[PDB]
């Protein structure tokens, strides 16, 4: 199963 990495960049 995939590691969940912290978000470091977002978009919108």
């Amino acid at each position: 199963n995939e590691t969940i990495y912290n978000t470091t960049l977002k978009y919108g």
């Epitope: 995939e2 912290n6 978000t7 470091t8 960049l9 977002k10 978009y11």
Partner: antibody, heavy 125, light 109 residues
Framework: QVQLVESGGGVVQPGRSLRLSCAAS????????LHWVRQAPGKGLEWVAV????????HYADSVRGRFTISRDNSKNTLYLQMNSLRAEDTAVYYC??????????????????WGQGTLVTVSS | EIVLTQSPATLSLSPGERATLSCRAS??????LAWYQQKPGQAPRLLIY???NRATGVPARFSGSGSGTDFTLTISSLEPEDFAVYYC??????????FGGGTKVEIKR
Amino acid sequence: QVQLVESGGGVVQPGRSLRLSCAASGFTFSNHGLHWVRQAPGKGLEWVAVVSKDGTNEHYADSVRGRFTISRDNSKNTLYLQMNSLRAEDTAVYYCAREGYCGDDRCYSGQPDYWGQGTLVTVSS
Amino acid sequence: EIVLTQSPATLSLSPGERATLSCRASQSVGRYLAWYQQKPGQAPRLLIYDSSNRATGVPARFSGSGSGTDFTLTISSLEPEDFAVYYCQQRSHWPPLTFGGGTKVEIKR
């Protein structure tokens, strides 16, 4: 297993164009952002571009903005780099790399975790 | 951009010895710093992320440390397959995603 296979590199003259492809398998393609990273002969790694997991957002290294376009087709599990206005300094092996999952929202991790084998682009007159 | 400075350029060591590699940042990246291994002709392989977390299949002899602007990768006892080039990479402030210039761990004779 995660698999990433890049193609499209070749000898190209300055000012002309080349298109790189990277085909992916072994993971949920639409869950991950995708990067291109290059390595000039005898030099280190340099980031090129990224595209969001849904293909609606992208970012570029300053030195390729207006020249390279990154895109993806989630229907074909394929990542692209359209390379225009090529210059001698673009000569490098180009790697495609997925980044780690960050969640369900409009996010990037910025953490490459699997890399392809690289495709060589040689820009020369 | 956040510039990463790696030192030394070359580490010359024998199998079984400890290797310690430095990566410094031009401003704080918190703990968002990763390390890769690359052998000639091959693609980079992720070893460490978030300064000290080991990635899949990475043996215990590799350890990462640091925060802010000061980071190290330690190989407690070099194996023959460990002689390669190592790169650090930050993800705190991007784009651009930035890489250090690399450290070559080579065989001493």
